[PDB]
């Protein structure tokens, strides 16, 4: 039954993705990575909260799905689906193998998929408005229990999901040096054809 | 209707430009490697190739050896100089080719034997005094002590055809006294059974040009004037064509020495490249025009 998962906690093998060589991989449990109002503008949703990872471990797609369902429901119930945009940053690309039950012909057939993470790697990030700003930290704490090891939820200086800090974003927006691209924005980029 | 660009930044990043002279279309490297290669057991002894190049109004004939960073021209002859030797017009014709080939060979053989004054090149290999269109090899006939200067034909991107003008220039050089390896298959008069000397001689001594000039005169006089306006202007008659070449082949043999021709170097107007501030001045002003709208 998917095994204990303490078996596949650490990155002990070189990355094994789905490829021409690796066939018959069971489909990953998590398919929805952009959730919430994933279509909101950069000027909406100013604050960001990130769930970081304190270990170099492999989380399973089963875990990643269990956490996103838990986190989405708490902030949607407490506030609204419209209030936040939650991105599961990690995607399950490694394909774990199980040797069915001796050590002859031990090469295992795929059992599932895991996400290789590192230290400080954000796993779940939420872009939120003020209505849900307080509730986001609790929601990401609910997700922390479904993820193996110790993780930390921190507020982000960067506006939304952009790389501009809230201070840089506010100043650039005032002088019209920011071009909106939808969920995210970039600097005006003075280069290229003038026309 | 919405196309994907063929030339993306990726195509420009992964693109490898070819050799400058291959991008230009001027050089066939595969053919030139074969002409350039000499066995390493022969070391740096110079190897010579006979380049013959036909422009729209010229036949350029050169003997060049390939150094490491350059190509050194041992001797050059151009059909532009044929008026000095008595060929007024038809300077890109088969007869002009032969004349430029003889001039190249004679100019080089003299230039090799200028100070030797004993048993050297031009005296040793006088060539075919009369330009009969017969197969002649300076090599093989007699090569002891001094040997015939050896060169190999470089035709460039020109097609090798029977009765080609590049082959005629080589025939002139062989007739001057230059060892150029040849088989005569791509020469007028070759038959599987055997060469007809007269057929090569006819093209070398005009003939077909003269025959056409007389055919037009016989029938379409208006066309005759249009086709051969310079020939009529220079008073070159159709029967007299063979004679002028015969005098020219003697003239090239007697005095093949190059005489420098004077000219003036005039640059065209040539526009000036702008300074960075000049480029910036235009850009800031162009943006201000957009601001003004």
């Amino acid at each position: 039954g998917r095994r204990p998962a303490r078996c596949y906690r650490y990155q002990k093998n070189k990355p094994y993705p789905k490829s021409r060589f690796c066939r018959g991989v069971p489909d990953p449990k998590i398919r929805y990575f952009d959730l919430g109002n994933r279509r909101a503008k950069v000027n909406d949703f100013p604050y960001c909260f990130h769930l970081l990872s304190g270990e170099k471990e492999q989380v399973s797609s089963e875990a990643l799905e269990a956490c996103r369902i838990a986190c989405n429901k708490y902030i949607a119930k407490k506030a609204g689906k419209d209030s936040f945009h939650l991105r599961i940053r990690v995607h399950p690309f490694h394909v774990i193998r199980i040797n069915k039950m001796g050590m002859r012909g031990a090469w295992g057939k795929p059992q599932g998929t895991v996400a290789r993470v590192s230290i400080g790697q954000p796993l779940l990030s939420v872009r939120c408005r003020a209505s849900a700003k307080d509730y986001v930290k609790d929601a990401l704490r609910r997700a922390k229990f479904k993820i193996p090891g110790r993780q930390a939820i921190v507020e982000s200086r960067n506006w939304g999901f952009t790389e501009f800090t809230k201070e840089e974003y506010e100043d650039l927006r005032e002088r019209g040096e920011l071009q909106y691209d939808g969920n995210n924005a970039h600097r005006i980029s003075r280069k290229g054809p003038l026309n | 209707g919405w196309v994907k660009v063929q030339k993306t930044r990726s195509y420009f990043k992964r693109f490898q430009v070819q050799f400058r002279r291959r991008r230009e279309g001027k050089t066939d490297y595969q053919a030139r490697k074969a002409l350039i290669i000499q066995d390493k057991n022969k070391y740096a002894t110079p190897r010579y190739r006979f380049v013959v190049r036909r422009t729209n109004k010229d036949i350029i004939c050169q003997v060049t050896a390939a150094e490491l960073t350059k190509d050194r021209v041992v001797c050059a002859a151009y059909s532009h100089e044929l008026p000095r030797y008595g060929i007024p017009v038809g300077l890109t014709n088969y007869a002009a080719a032969y004349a430029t080939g003889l001039l190249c060979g004679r100019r080089l053989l003299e230039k090799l034997s200028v100070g030797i004054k004993e048993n050297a090149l031009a005296q040793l290999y006088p060539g075919l005094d009369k330009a009969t269109g017969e197969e002649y090899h300076p090599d093989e006939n007699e090569n002891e002590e001094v040997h015939a200067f050896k060169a190999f034909l470089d035709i460039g991107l020109a097609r090798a055809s029977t009765g080609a003008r590049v082959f005629a220039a080589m025939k002139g050089a062989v007739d001057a006294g230059l060892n150029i390896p040849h088989s005569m298959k791509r020469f007028p008069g070759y038959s599987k059974d055997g060469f007809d000397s007269s057929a090569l001689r006819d093209r070398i001594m005009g003939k077909h040009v003269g025959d056409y000039m007389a055919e037009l005169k016989a029938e379409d006089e208006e066309t005759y004037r249009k086709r051969f306006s310079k020939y009529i202007a220079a008073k070159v008659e159709p029967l007299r064509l063979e004679a002028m070449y015969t005098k020219a082949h003697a003239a090239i043999r007697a005095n093949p020495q190059a005489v420098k021709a004077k000219f003036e170097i005039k640059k065209p107007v040539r526009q000036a490249r702008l300074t960075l501030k000049e480029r910036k001045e235009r850009i800031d002003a162009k943006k201000l025009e957009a601001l003004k709208q």
Binding site: - | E24, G25, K26, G156, A158, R159
Partner: protein
């Protein structure tokens, strides 16, 4: 207004893709030869498809490239079959244009049972002096954008030379 900017027909290609019959293709070759006074060439099939009933390497088409007076003389007859009416969209980005007529009888060929009706597509290529730069073996370089025929420049010259209405 350089004389070298003058647009001339480079050539006219008349292709007859009869299909995999073989018998009809020789008869189409005869029809093409009578129109152009030059031997047509036969085009082999690249792949095989049952819907077309062709196997790879079977001769499936017949084409001729006619240049000079014969080109525009033939083109005029083809245009007459469409009453000098052209689609407007028929002009390509590179300035070429095509007709495409059904039947060979209209081009003034006399109907015979041995050669049954054989339609062909007339393609007219519009050139200018100096397009040799892209076709010469030595120093081949692309033509400049200016000297290339715009689709609009093609329509204007054909309206002057053939009085066509779009």
């Amino acid at each position: 207004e350089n004389p070298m900017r003058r647009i001339r027909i480079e050539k006219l290609v008349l292709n007859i893709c009869i299909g995999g019959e073989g018998d009809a293709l020789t008869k189409a070759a005869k029809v093409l030869q009578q129109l152009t006074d030059q031997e047509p060439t036969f085009s082999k099939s690249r792949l095989t498809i049952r819907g077309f009933g062709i196997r790879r390497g079977q001769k499936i088409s017949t084409h001729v490239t006619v240049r000079g007076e014969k080109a525009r003389e033939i083109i005029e007859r083809g245009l007459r079959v469409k009453n000098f009416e052209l689609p407007y969209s028929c002009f390509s980005t590179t300035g070429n244009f095509g007709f495409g007529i059904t039947e060979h009888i209209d081009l003034g060929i006399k109907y015979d049972p041995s050669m049954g009706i054989y339609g062909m597509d007339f393609y007219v290529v519009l050139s200018r002096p100096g397009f040799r730069v892209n076709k010469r073996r030595a120093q081949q370089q692309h033509v400049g954008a200016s000297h290339k025929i715009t689709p609009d420049e093609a329509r204007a010259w054909v309206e002057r030379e053939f009085e066509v209405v779009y």
